[PDB]
From a paper:
We identify a highly abundant classical pre-translocation intermediate with eukaryotic elongation factor 1a (eEF1a) in an extended conformation, suggesting that eEF1a may remain associated with the ribosome after GTP hydrolysis during proofreading. Next, we observe a highly abundant intermediate (33%) that has not been described previously: whereas the tRNA is accommodated in the canonical A-site and the SSU ‘rolls’ into the classical pre-configuration, eEF1a is bound to the ribosome in an extended conformation, which matches crystal structures of purified eEF1A–GDP26 and its bacterial homologue EF-Tu–GDP27. To analyse the pre+ state at higher resolution, we rapidly isolated soluble ribosomes and imaged them with cryo-EM single-particle analysis (SPA). Approximately 30% of particles were in the pre+ state, yielding a focused reconstruction of eEF1a with specific side chains of domain 3 (approximately 3.5 Å resolution) unambiguously identifying eEF1a. In the classical pre+ state, eEF1a domains 1 and 3 interact with the sarcin–ricin loop (SRL) of the 28S rRNA, whereas domain 2 blocks the A/T site and contacts the A-site tRNA. In a model of the human elongation cycle, we propose that the classical pre+ state may follow the decoding state, in which eEF1a still adopts a compact conformation. Although we cannot rule out that other factors observed at this site in situ could have been displaced by eEF1A during the purification, the occurrence of the eEF1A bound classical pre+ state in purified samples indicates the possibility that eEF1a may remain bound to the ribosome during conformational switching to the extended form. The functional relevance of a possible eEF1a-bound classical pre+ state remains to be further investigated with complementary methods.
Residue numbers in the entry: 4 to 445
Write the structure that this text describes.
RNA sequence: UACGAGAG
């Protein structure tokens, strides 16, 4: 009955994602040896070469393409604490689409960092995808990160302490820069080919006394990688964050008054709160909250409640408004926001000034594509062109949007229910993306 | 699961 966890394996090409994942699957005992050899021989027949530990993640990537799904029972294995399933990994056509749309959602990210001579340098170079992948993971809101320092068996001396520390520190400063505190990240020197250190201390690694992570939830320490997968925590509702409540409708009930209606996305709504409506900037008091024809002392995330407010007319507040706590991170109007989008099937080309309608939470406002900033490869997330001339179907890009009318939006990392939007033109959804940063208006 | 950018 162990709770389930979704894993995405990110990292630079040839850094050892597939090998590490496949060897982990082998050691975890999720697949019997006979079936393992059968699938190894199948892979050898399909492609020329040796696919030992490589057929697992490569097969997963190949089965996440062109909407063909036969079986996913192979990539489900059991740790001591959880049942963990490999979902997706970079290196296929639909990776970015699955990441942005959420069809492939992951609770924790396993960054495999190649660590031998020349590898750790290349992975973080201009052409390296390590930085791209970590930035994408942070953008998507995957705040739990595992760093596998892989193929370490290749230094001189064979397992260098200072090479490990070099990678660790130069990674740690950079992700302190982007937003992961290095203390919560477990670092483990491994070689996916050797199966080094995966489930028990490696005899080749006497100096690696163990890994230690310092988290707000408490410190944890270990040696092997299985324990790293055992450090993960379950998914949960945001019932401690500030209040956020998109307005779906506002009604005028005879003998009661104005009664906005919507679903609580984060935080708590209770009677007596002083609430602020954005972007209209209207502050009032909640007279009462009703759900299931009963008076509710508090409204939890997910509760679609209707609450009565005083001194506010129905013409004052409307659909698309975001309601929040007036004295705890209150909602505010968005002057502009920067988002990363992937262009779906579009009748033509997208240029600067393109102004489609944006559907964010319950809002429906036309936003102008002010600037076409960057063009991103949809296959690996690698930056291809800066300031592209135009965008077509299949192009991933980062653009700046200016709402044509007052709009209230949030970033995907902080308030996921209000950070993802859909771009629709005519009857077609031409693009879907997530918001990175928002410039709150005065 | 159909439907949906997602919640559902």
């Amino acid at each position: 009955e162990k709770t389930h966890i979704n894993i995405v394996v990110i990292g630079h090409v040839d850094s050892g994602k597939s090998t590490t994942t496949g060897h982990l699957i082998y050691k975890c005992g999720g697949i019997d040896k006979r079936t393992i050899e059968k699938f190894e021989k199948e892979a050898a027949e399909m492609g020329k070469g040796s696919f030992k530990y490589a057929w697992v993640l490569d097969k997963l990537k190949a089965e996440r393409e062109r909407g063909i799904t036969i079986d996913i029972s192979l990539w489900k294995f059991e740790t001591t604490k959880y049942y963990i399933t490999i979902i997706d990994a970079p290196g296929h056509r639909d990776f970015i689409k699955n990441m942005i749309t959420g069809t492939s959602q992951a609770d924790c990210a396993v960054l495999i960092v190649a660590a031998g001579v020349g590898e750790f340098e290349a992975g973080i170079s201009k052409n390296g995808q390590t930085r791209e992948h970590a930035l994408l993971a942070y953008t998507l809101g995957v705040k739990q990160l595992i760093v596998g320092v892989n193929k370490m068996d290749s230094t001189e001396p064979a397992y260098s302490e200072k090479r490990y520390d070099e990678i660790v520190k130069e990674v740690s400063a950079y992700i302190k820069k982007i937003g992961y505190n290095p203390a919560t990240v477990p670092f483990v020197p491994i070689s996916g080919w050797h199966g080094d250190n995966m489930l028990e201390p490696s005899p080749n690694m006497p100096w690696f006394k163990g890994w230690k992570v310092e988290r707000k939830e408490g410190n944890a320490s270990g040696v092997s990688l299985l324990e790293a997968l055992d450090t993960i925590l379950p998914p949960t509702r945001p019932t401690d964050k500030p209040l956020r409540l998109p307005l779906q409708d506002v009604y005028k009930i005879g003998g009661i008054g104005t009664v906005p209606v919507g679903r609580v996305e984060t935080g708590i709504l209770r009677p007596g709160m002083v609430v602020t409506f954005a972007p209209v900037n209207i502050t009032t008091e909640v007279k009462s909250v009703e759900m299931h024809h009963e008076a509710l002392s508090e409204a939890l995330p997910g509760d679609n409640v209707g609450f009565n407010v005083k001194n506010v007319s129905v013409k004052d507040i409307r659909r698309g408004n975001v309601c929040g706590d007036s004295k705890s991170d209150p909602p505010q109007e968005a002057a502009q926001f920067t988002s990363q989008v992937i262009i779906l099937n579009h009748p033509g080309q997208i240029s600067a000034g393109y102004s489609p309608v944006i559907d964010c939470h319950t809002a429906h406002i036309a936003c102008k594509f002010a600037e076409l900033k960057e063009k991103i490869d949809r296959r690996s997330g690698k930056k291809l062109e800066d300031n592209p001339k135009s965008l077509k179907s299949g192009d991933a890009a980062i653009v700046e949007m200016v709402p044509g009318k007052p709009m209230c939006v949030e970033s995907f990392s902080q308030y996921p229910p209000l950070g993802r939007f859909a771009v629709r033109d005519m009857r077609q959804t031409v693009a879907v993306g997530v918001i990175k940063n928002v410039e709150k208006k005065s």
